Amino acid sequence: TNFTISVTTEILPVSMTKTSVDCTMYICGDSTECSNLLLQYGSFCTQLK
Amino acid sequence: TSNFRVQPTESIVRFPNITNLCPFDEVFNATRFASVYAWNRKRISNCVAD
Ligand SMILES: *[C@@H]1O[C@H](CO)[C@@H](O[C@@H]2O[C@H](CO)[C@@H](O)[C@H](O)[C@H]2NC(C)=O)[C@H](O)[C@H]1NC(C)=O
Ligand SMILES: *[C@@H]1O[C@H](CO)[C@@H](O)[C@H](O)[C@H]1NC(C)=O
Ligand SMILES: *[C@@H]1O[C@H](CO)[C@@H](O)[C@H](O)[C@H]1NC(C)=O
């Protein structure tokens, strides 16, 4: 015999903070010899980028 | 493609040198030496080595 108007909240995530990973300076830092050694590992950093 | 970096150019090593040098000849040109079981330990510190 009666009606009620109810308002409900629904929270759904949309996205997240985009992050860029620099493989070379995170793994080997500023060392040139470490970068030369890592260059023989292939293209892992390029694939992850 | 790549990343931007600043190449090193000069050194700003910050530790003033110690007033004396390390006497490495004390353990090398000693007039006598100790045995293996009871050696002689000479702590060399606060100096500049070569
Ligand atoms: C249906 O319900 C509403 C409230 O949910 C009723 O409205 C109330 O009516 C009384 C008297 O008529 C007032 O004193 C209130 O202030 C009203 N409430 C609101 C929120 O306005 C309504 O009367 C009900 N209808 C029936 C047929 O029972
Ligand atoms: C240390 O530096 C002083 C100058 O501040 C210099 O005269 C001395 O020959 C240097 N060598 C030593 C003692 O380590
Ligand atoms: C001991 O030998 C070293 C190396 O030959 C030499 O420099 C030094 O003058 C000698 N004498 C002493 C007292 O260290």
- Pocket test of ligand 2: the residue of B15, B18, B19 to mutate, having most ligand atoms within 8 Å of its CB, is B19
PDB experimental method: cryo-EM
* Residue A38, H or E segment: helix A32-38
- Tell me the two tokens of residue B46: 């606060």
- Give the residues across from B21 on adjacent strands: B48
Angstrom distance (rounded) from CA A11 to CA A2 = 29
- Tell me the two tokens of residue A5: 């108007």
Long-range contacts of B43-46 (CB under 8 A, 24+ apart): B46/B18, B46/B20
Q: How far is the CA of B27 from the centre of ligand 3 (A)?
A: 10
Residue ID of nearest Cα to ligand 2 atom 2: B17
DSSP code of residue B18: P
Residue type, position A18, single letter: K
List the one residue out of B24, B14, B19, B16 whose CA is nearest residue B49.
B24
Angstrom distance (rounded) from CA A2 to CA B37 = 101
Q: Where are the alpha helices (DSSP H) in chain A?
A: 23-27, 32-38, 44-48
Q: Which residues contact A49 (CB under 8 A, 6 or more apart)?
A: A20, A21, A23
- Tell me the two tokens of residue A19: 């992050």
Resolution in angstrom units: 6.2
